[PDB]
């Protein structure tokens, strides 16, 4: 707009002019919360002329109570201070208290030196005697978000952080949610480890890859949709307890609980099962939920703050659903053995025509398990709860099931029906590993997108002995959704994926 | 030519179907293998505690025998080793016919085993097994050491056999991990907080290196992997974070070396209100520490040609020396450059003095990456010690503000250990007429070969007419720290998975 163009002429006019033009270095006395927590106790109108303080930040307002007073305020690392600049007061070394203040726009970031204290009134307050332009701001800012739509706080992130608090919070929440987590397996003798996102072959996960290519090794290469698969091969070579915390790279959906690029944390630990990680499990989230919250039941707003407010409740010890005796119980009526067979493929489908449940493809014994428990399963879970011992063909690294037949040793942790936790005692035999990745190929190569080619790699690595051992996978992500109440995973991620 | 690998497949098989124990899936221990050291290491020789049985487990790595009737293990786990001494007079026949629970095990094996603590008479801490399970069979028959592989190769190719057999290998990431976290205790303290911002990028920028691309398809638009987060780490200061920092991979799509993987883990901070000036003393502050805290002092070994060659010292005392880059080039040719430094005059120059000096010629010829081969053969050839070299050329610095006394120059240092860049920061430019000029002059690089050039942001530059406040930021080469902490030539020795040919 006119507003942009008039700022760079008034800009060039300020560098030929000899003024000063963005300079290198402004050295602050203290920052704005330590000037706050020195001065904030002060008699009201008490001023120290003995003492001047520079101070700077991002102007959030001017006011030119008269033509001798122009009030300011500046804002901070979450402090507000408010700069009295009276011309009796100017520094005409820096020049006319006019022309001096006439450089200045809400939204600069500018600096002031002054005589501390706290005004008549009794906010706290510099006296300042001069004012420097550090780096204005081109453009004309609104008040708060409601000035902006909405979907600039997401393409704009530095304005949704410059202008909104809240959003600022999610993202020092975040840090310390992760800060808690990594000390939780710390403590605990973990080894965080960092494994490849460039691979080879994919796999550790149910999803379509990004495809890139490396031009002096004349390769195509994947980026990675989980790092389970050369995880589990440190336990291989000893480790014992190893995690990482990462990105992961997934091709498909973006909704509210999906985007590209996601945060995840996966540990594997010896000599663990499934029922070890449960246990873990609770420990970890509810003791983080009690961190952040100060008590295990929270609020969340499915549909935003003036929406319905749902209670979560962590307490401990959670509730179980088994995966197929729960939809069994739904669909009052008993699955076809064996699970992936033609005659259970038959009757899934046509269970699904009967409760209105969206076919999948390819029709899959596993994706439409998926659906069943999608409908009459993941529906149940409002509290955090385990959706326990999922079939075989559903989950091909998942050891088998000590006692259920056709089941495996795995669980999903779900909070208000959204995933949060995979987790499973590992498979560690290589011939059944094997019959189960080429499962795998056969279901890529008849249209399943989301199945993963043989990686021989780690056949050889099981071939070395995984010992018996349990993991585990988090997105992080979706647990800063329920740690911040937000439903909509951009608002937890700084620069989520946009269309544009 | 290897029939261990099929009868180990068949004795499985065997196992399997004659109902004895194949791949349990929970086995309970007692105690780890460094808790059991812990508590009976002191125990006098011949010790054994018949009223207390324990349960333990490891990787076999020794078997031998004296009779049929007492069979010496010793097994592996969490960095220690125990002595497993299984007499047949203390044989549990319910798991099986002593013979045969034994002859199921080979080295290898990840095994249990059930006893009595205490020490033999030779004073070795031992259990002395009533049962033996095996867990996970090793189905290849494994060298005592990384010596017995085939190739050294293969310690990169199959890392859990590194791991397995050497310490070595197993210190490299714990310091790894050990260092990382001493770096984030660093800036924690400081008050700063840790964002991660976007590897897929649909505009790369922040660094000179060719991108990967890749493509969303439900977006249906061409991504790049990213090259490094600065051009979005500057965004989050504008928006007021003040400090920020970010620990993670980027991607380069370029050579493989000694020094270069095509993912590699760096530390990008960014601090509002700091200078260059301040980014060097607080490099020296965290390096120096972190140093000592390794080392117990700041002068330190390197083999730069292995362990049984020479060896010298790095001295990381401070303050480290500064070399300023353009001054040092030219007292290295014995003239002077030509100005402007980007003038046609001072490329056909500088031409001629990489043919003069025989310095392989970069392509294309641009100033910047006549300078850059200049420098790295006249000035970063004097870093051993840890050396800032300092005021880079603008022409080759597009997102440095310009040097507050020196034209043509930036507020820009470069940190060079043994020659090898570990760090690169700058007083951030912010002035957005100027950083839109040089990013219209990288554009014509890259048009004109450079594949380091990158194209303009939009995004960034309307960032930066909201105001970014004066800063200072700052990136750090995580593996390659790690190379001279841990004293390696060889950035496959500090990642776990290196990226290795066909
Ligand atoms: C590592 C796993 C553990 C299971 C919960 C969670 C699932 C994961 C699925 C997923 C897929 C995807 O394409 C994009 C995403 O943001 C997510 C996510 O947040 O969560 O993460
Ligand atoms: C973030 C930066 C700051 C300067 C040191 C270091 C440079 C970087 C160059 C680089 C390029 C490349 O293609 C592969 C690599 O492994 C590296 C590396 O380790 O170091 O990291
Ligand atoms: N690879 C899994 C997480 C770990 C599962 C247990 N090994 C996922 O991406 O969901
Ligand atoms: N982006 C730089 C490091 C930060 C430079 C200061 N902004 C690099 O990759 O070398």
Same mark, same amino acid.
């Given at each position: 707009?006119?507003?942009?163009?008039?700022? @760079?002429?008034?800009? !060039?006019?300020?560098?030929?002019?000899?003024?000063?033009?963005?300079? %290198?270095?402004?050295?602050? &006395?203290?920052?704005?919360?330590? @000037?706050?927590?020195?001065?904030?106790?002060?008699?009201?109108? /008490?001023?120290?002329?003995?003492?001047?303080?520079?101070?700077?930040?991002?102007?959030?307002?001017?006011?030119?109570?008269?033509?001798?007073?122009?009030?300011?305020?500046?804002?901070?690392?979450?402090?507000?201070?408010?700069?009295?600049?009276?011309?009796?007061? +100017?520094?005409? &070394?820096?020049?006319?208290?006019?022309?001096?203040?006439? !450089?200045?726009?809400?939204?600069?970031?500018?600096?002031?030196?002054?005589?501390?204290?706290?005004?008549? =009134?009794?906010? *706290? &307050?510099?006296?300042?005697?001069?004012?420097?332009?550090?780096?204005?701001?081109?453009?004309?800012?609104?008040?708060?978000?409601?000035?902006?739509?909405?979907?600039?706080?997401?393409?704009? =992130?530095?304005?949704?952080?410059?202008?909104?608090?809240?959003?600022?919070?999610?993202?020092?929440?975040? $840090?310390?949610?992760?800060?808690?987590? =990594?000390?939780?397996?710390?403590?605990?003798?973990?080894?965080?480890?960092?494994?490849?996102?460039?691979?080879?072959? @994919?796999?550790?996960?149910?999803?379509?890859?990004?495809?890139?290519? +490396?031009?002096? *090794?004349?390769?195509?290469?994947?980026?990675?949709?989980?790092?389970?698969?050369?995880?589990?091969?440190?336990?291989?070579?000893?480790?014992?307890?190893?995690?990482?915390?990462?990105?992961?790279?997934?091709?498909?959906?973006?909704?509210?609980?999906?985007?590209?690029?996601?945060?995840?944390?996966?540990?594997?630990?010896? /000599?663990?099962?499934?029922?070890?990680?449960?246990?873990?499990?609770?420990?970890?989230?509810?003791?983080?939920?009690?961190?952040?919250?100060? $008590?295990?039941?929270?609020?969340?707003?499915?549909?935003?703050?003036?929406?319905?407010?749902?209670?979560?409740?962590?307490?401990?010890?959670?509730?179980?659903?088994?995966?197929?005796?729960?939809?069994?119980?739904?669909?009052?009526?008993?699955?076809? =053995?064996?699970?992936?067979?033609?005659?259970?493929?038959?009757?899934?489908?046509?269970?699904?025509?009967? %409760?209105?449940?969206? *076919?999948? +493809?390819?029709?899959?014994?596993?994706?439409?398990?998926?659906?069943?428990?999608? +409908?009459?399963?993941?529906?149940?879970?409002?509290?955090?709860?385990?959706?326990?011992? %999922?079939?075989?063909?559903?989950?091909? *690294?998942?050891?088998?099931?000590?006692?259920?037949?056709?089941?495996?040793?795995?669980?999903?942790?779900?909070?208000?029906?959204?995933?949060?936790?995979?987790?499973?005692?590992?498979?560690?035999?290589?011939?059944?590993?094997?019959?189960?990745?080429?499962?795998?190929?056969?279901?890529?190569?008849?249209?399943?997108?989301?199945?993963?080619?043989?990686? !021989?790699?780690?056949?050889?690595?099981?071939?070395?002995?995984?010992?018996?051992?349990?993991?585990?996978?988090?997105?992080?992500?979706?647990?800063?959704?329920?740690?911040?109440?937000?439903?909509?995973?951009?608002?937890?991620?700084?620069?989520?994926?946009?269309?544009?």
């Amino acid at each position: 707009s006119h507003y942009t163009d008039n700022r @760079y002429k008034m800009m !060039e006019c300020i560098k030929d002019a000899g003024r000063p033009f963005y300079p %290198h270095k402004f050295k602050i &006395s203290m920052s704005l919360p330590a @000037y706050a927590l020195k001065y904030g106790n002060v008699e009201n109108g /008490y001023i120290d002329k003995d003492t001047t303080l520079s101070l700077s930040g991002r102007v959030t307002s001017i006011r030119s109570s008269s033509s001798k007073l122009i009030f300011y305020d500046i804002f901070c690392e979450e402090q507000k201070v408010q700069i009295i600049a009276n011309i009796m007061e +100017h520094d005409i &070394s820096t020049g006319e208290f006019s022309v001096s203040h006439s !450089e200045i726009r809400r939204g600069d970031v500018v600096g002031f030196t002054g005589f501390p204290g706290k005004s008549k =009134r009794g906010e *706290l &307050s510099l006296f300042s005697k001069s004012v420097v332009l550090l780096s204005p701001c081109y453009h004309m800012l609104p008040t708060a978000i409601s000035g902006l739509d909405q979907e600039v706080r997401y393409r704009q =992130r530095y304005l949704d952080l410059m202008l909104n608090e809240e959003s600022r919070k999610v993202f020092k929440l975040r $840090s310390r949610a992760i800060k808690y987590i =990594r000390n939780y397996f710390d403590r605990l003798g973990f080894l965080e480890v960092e494994t490849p996102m460039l691979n080879m072959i @994919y796999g550790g996960a149910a999803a379509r890859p990004f495809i890139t290519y +490396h031009n002096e *090794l004349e390769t195509q290469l994947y980026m990675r949709i989980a790092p389970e698969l050369y995880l589990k091969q440190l336990i291989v070579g000893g480790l014992d307890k190893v995690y990482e915390i990462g990105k992961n790279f997934r091709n498909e959906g973006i909704d509210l609980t999906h985007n590209p690029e996601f945060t995840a944390m996966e540990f594997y630990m010896a /000599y663990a099962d499934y029922y070890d990680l449960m246990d873990l499990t609770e420990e970890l989230i509810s003791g983080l939920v009690l961190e952040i919250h100060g $008590s295990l039941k929270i609020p969340y707003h499915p549909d935003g703050p003036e929406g319905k407010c749902i209670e979560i409740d962590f307490t401990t010890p959670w509730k179980r659903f088994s995966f197929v005796e729960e939809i069994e119980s739904g669909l009052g009526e008993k699955l076809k =053995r064996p699970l992936d067979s033609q005659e259970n493929i038959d009757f899934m489908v046509e269970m699904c025509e009967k %409760h209105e449940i969206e *076919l999948p +493809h390819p029709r899959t014994a596993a994706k439409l398990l998926d659906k069943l428990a999608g +409908h009459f399963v993941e529906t149940k879970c409002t509290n955090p709860s385990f959706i326990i011992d %999922h079939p075989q063909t559903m989950s091909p *690294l998942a050891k088998w099931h000590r006692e259920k037949p056709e089941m495996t040793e795995r669980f999903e942790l779900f909070v208000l029906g959204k995933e949060l936790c995979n987790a499973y005692t590992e498979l560690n035999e290589p011939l059944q590993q094997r019959k189960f990745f080429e499962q795998q190929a056969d279901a890529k190569a008849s249209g399943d997108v989301e199945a993963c080619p043989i990686d !021989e790699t780690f056949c050889l690595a099981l071939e070395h002995g995984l010992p018996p051992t349990g993991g585990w996978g988090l997105g992080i992500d979706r647990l800063i959704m329920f740690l911040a109440d937000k439903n909509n995973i951009k608002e937890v991620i700084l620069f989520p994926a946009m269309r544009n």
